[PDB]
């Protein structure tokens, strides 16, 4: 049964801090507590340790990432830029 | 010792003799743990004896976790109906 | 602090040249479901350890007591 | 209902001042000071506990025999069997690739 209408994980804060601030925390809290796919073993076993550290439960491998997500949008763009420039110096 | 014998007969247990809540006297989680362990123990007993198959066992395993049976004999009656059809 | 269950090694200890004293202890204990029997313990005082041999048969106990070296100080009870 | 006391001068409940209650041949309760529990040696590569190795405080390993501190295999008391297996497979395949 659905327990809360819209607060979700932010129900632990009660009525404090303001609805707008609680809404911002809710979006980032879900991402940092989420489970992610591992690119090395293909399983859904990647969770966060400290901020920017992501470790897979299987295959015991740790990847440096974003504060609250495994990969940021800015880092994805950088990979494309490096790949494009890499192919212009070797071919 | 005399007072303990009366309580085992059911005396001194009315509403005027209770000062803690029902949870404080007996936690709800303790009750749930005892009955869920009873249901799972029965299911493994039937499967290992060949009285039930793993396919029906797996279905009944997740039904007991879902609060489908209120006690042991409710599960037994359900198994009889399942095996009678 | 150590127990031996072999008679052959027990006699070797009694002539180890560092053993000077020994004691014999008689225990009156009950068996599983029978008449009481006398239990004897042979304790050899070594330099570092005390070795205890326990035998429940009185017939073999008498032979072992006689076979002890005559130069060993043996304390009865 | 017998109560006990510390047997040393330290009156605080620190990691080095832990006690256990035992009953003596005299028929009374008495505190027994217990040493901190030991930790199993871990694999050098994967970090998991090593099988077949005794668990002792660091100074106690000097008193036990070598058979309690190693395994009859390469990297016996350092790396576990699976990590040793990976080392051998990697060593063979990489060196073969070097020739070609």
């Amino acid at each position: 049964a659905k327990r809360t209408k819209k607060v979700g994980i932010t129900g632990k804060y009660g009525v404090r801090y303001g609805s707008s601030l609680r809404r911002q925390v809710k979006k980032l809290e879900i991402q940092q507590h989420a489970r992610y796919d591992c690119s090395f073993c293909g399983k859904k076993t990647v969770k966060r340790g400290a901020a920017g550290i992501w470790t897979c439960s299987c295959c015991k491998k740790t990847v440096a990432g974003g504060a609250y997500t495994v990969s940021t949008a800015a880092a994805a763009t950088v990979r494309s830029t490096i790949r494009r420039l890499r192919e212009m110096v070797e071919a | 010792r005399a007072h303990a014998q009366s309580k085992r007969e059911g005396r001194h247990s009315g509403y005027g003799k209770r000062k803690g809540t029902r949870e404080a006297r007996l936690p709800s989680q303790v009750v749930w743990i005892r009955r869920l362990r009873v249901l799972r123990r029965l299911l493994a007993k039937y499967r290992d004896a060949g009285k039930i198959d793993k396919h029906l066992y797996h279905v009944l395993y997740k039904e007991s976790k879902g609060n489908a049976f209120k006690h042991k004999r409710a599960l037994v009656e359900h198994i009889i109906q399942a095996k009678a059809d | 602090a150590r127990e031996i269950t072999d008679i052959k090694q027990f006699l070797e200890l009694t002539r180890r040249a560092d053993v000077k004293t020994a004691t014999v202890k008689i225990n009156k204990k009950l068996n599983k479901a029978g008449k009481p029997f006398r239990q004897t313990k042979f304790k050899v005082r070594g330099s570092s350890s005390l070795y205890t041999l326990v035998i429940n048969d009185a017939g073999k106990a008498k032979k072992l007591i006689q076979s002890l070296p005559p130069t060993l100080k043996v304390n009865r009870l | 209902a017998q109560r006990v006391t510390f047997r040393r001068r330290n009156p605080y409940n620190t990691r080095s001042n832990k006690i256990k209650v035992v009953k003596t041949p005299g028929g009374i309760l008495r505190a027994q000071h217990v040493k901190k529990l030991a930790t199993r040696p871990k694999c050098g590569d994967c970090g998991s506990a090593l099988q077949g190795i005794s668990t002792l405080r660091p100074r106690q390993y000097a008193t036990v025999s070598k058979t309690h501190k190693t395994v009859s295999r390469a990297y016996g008391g350092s790396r576990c069997a699976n990590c040793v297996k990976e080392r051998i497979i990697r060593a063979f395949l990489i060196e073969e690739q070097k020739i070609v």
Binding site: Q24, A51, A64, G65, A67, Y68, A74 | - | - | -
Partner: protein, 244 residues
């Protein structure tokens, strides 16, 4: 009056950094023969948290060229670097994330981090989480390189200065509100003693230039010139403009 709060911090008694739990200073390798002529391969051992630092750190092991042993280096981990990855550092290193190259051996538009201001100072620029340096030009005749800094400034750096390909990991940290005083307390518990802060207008005249008055107000312009002396520089120092 008495010595004001910002003057007392220079004595460094209770205002020093709390460095008990630090993993170590994060620096590149010492510029050596292998770095300036070829490349040397290192292996990432682990990625660990560092107290007082948002960005994670990477432990990379290299072999000693001149004697038989291993050398441990502490790097700031970029996004995408993982345990077990090989790291290549030197003049002839490839253009891949995590590799350390001179700024003169990379093309235009390359994104780099932990950039040396001078060759051999082992990383000075773009160290905080999510920050990077954009390379925007080369001057081969003058052996110089033009870059753009996270603040937006344009700087000219020697082409022999080194940098790490990629962006510093841990980005997006400051987008989450702290939401209460307790989390602010634990943040600065592992940095230094600079929190909480008392407003100057709440103090007495002996304590702060903003102190005193039957109302809580500053009473004179808060824009203070660059030429003012210690005890006067409270407020907006050498402000070119104010307002929203």
């Amino acid at each position: 009056g008495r010595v004001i709060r910002n003057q007392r911090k220079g004595a460094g008694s209770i205002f020093t950094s709390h460095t008990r739990l630090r993993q170590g200073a994060a620096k590149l390798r010492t510029l050596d023969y292998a770095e300036r002529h070829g490349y040397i391969r290192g292996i990432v051992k682990q990625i660990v948290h560092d107290s007082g630092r948002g960005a994670p750190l990477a432990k990379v092991v290299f072999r000693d060229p001149y004697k038989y042993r291993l050398r441990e280096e502490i790097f700031i981990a970029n996004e995408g670097v993982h345990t077990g990855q090989f790291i290549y550092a030197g003049k002839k290193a490839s253009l891949n994330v995590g590799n350390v190259l001179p700024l003169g051996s990379v093309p235009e538009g390359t994104i780099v981090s932990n950039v040396e201001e001078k060759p051999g100072d082992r990383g000075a620029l773009a160290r905080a989480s999510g920050n990077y340096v954009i390379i925007i030009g080369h001057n081969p005749d003058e052996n110089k390189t033009r870059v753009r800094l996270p603040s937006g400034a344009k700087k000219v750096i020697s082409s022999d200065a080194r940098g790490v390909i990629g962006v510093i990991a841990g980005g997006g940290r400051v987008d989450k509100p702290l939401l209460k005083a307790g989390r602010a307390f634990h943040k600065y518990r592992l940095k230094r003693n600079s929190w909480p802060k008392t407003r100057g207008v709440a103090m007495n005249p002996v304590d702060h230039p903003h102190g005193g008055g039957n109302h809580q107000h500053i009473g004179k312009a808060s824009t203070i010139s660059r030429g003012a002396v210690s005890g006067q520089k409270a407020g907006l120092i050498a402000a070119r403009r104010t307002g929203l």
